[PDB]
């Protein structure tokens, strides 16, 4: 159905935290699972403070909806432990 | 959380699926009462640009699913 260029940035406090976000999304994080990892282009990676995600995306929007939704709520997940 | 910029686009396979997608998304946006967090969005011919700044991850989550959820009802009504 469609093409999805999408770029999300997360800016935070210090270096470390970014990183400790970027590191909580990227490994072992199961609010995202592996089917719609390995559907789309899906990178998230610090960069200094802020922690960038970008997705390339083609195919139908319901997995592109389902895959951010799960990644926002992972970088959530991950704000929320670390800041407890 | 500081601030959490977002920038979606979206290409749409006809001129004509843009603009219906675009007119009954607008009519959302324009209403929205409760102002999560800014998203200034706009049609660039067969794409849409979705350009959100919020506050928090509740707020990015919420536009995020809210703007692309109404693109698929479009989608989806348009395309029964």
Redesign the interface.
């Known amino acids: 159905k469609i093409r999805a260029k999408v770029e999300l940035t997360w800016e935070y406090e210090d270096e470390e935290t970014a990183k400790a976000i970027a590191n909580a999304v990227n490994v072992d994080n199961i609010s995202i699972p592996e089917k719609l990892k390995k559907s789309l282009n899906l990178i998230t990676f610090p960069d200094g403070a802020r922690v960038v995600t970008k997705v390339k995306y083609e195919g139908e929007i319901e997995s592109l909806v389902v895959a951010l939704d799960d990644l926002i709520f992972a970088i959530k997940v991950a704000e929320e432990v670390l800041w407890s | 959380?500081?601030?959490?910029?977002?920038?979606?686009?979206?290409?749409?396979?006809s001129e004509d699926i843009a603009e219906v997608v675009y007119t009954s998304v607008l009519y959302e946006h324009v209403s929205v009462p409760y102002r999560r967090s800014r998203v200034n969005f706009r049609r660039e011919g067969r794409r849409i640009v979705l350009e959100i700044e919020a506050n928090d991850?509740?707020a990015?989550?919420g536009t995020?699913?809210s703007y692309?959820?109404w693109?698929?009802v479009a989608?989806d009504v348009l395309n029964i």
């Open positions: 959380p500081k601030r959490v910029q977002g920038k979606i686009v979206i290409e749409f396979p991850s509740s990015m989550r995020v699913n692309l959820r693109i698929k989608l």
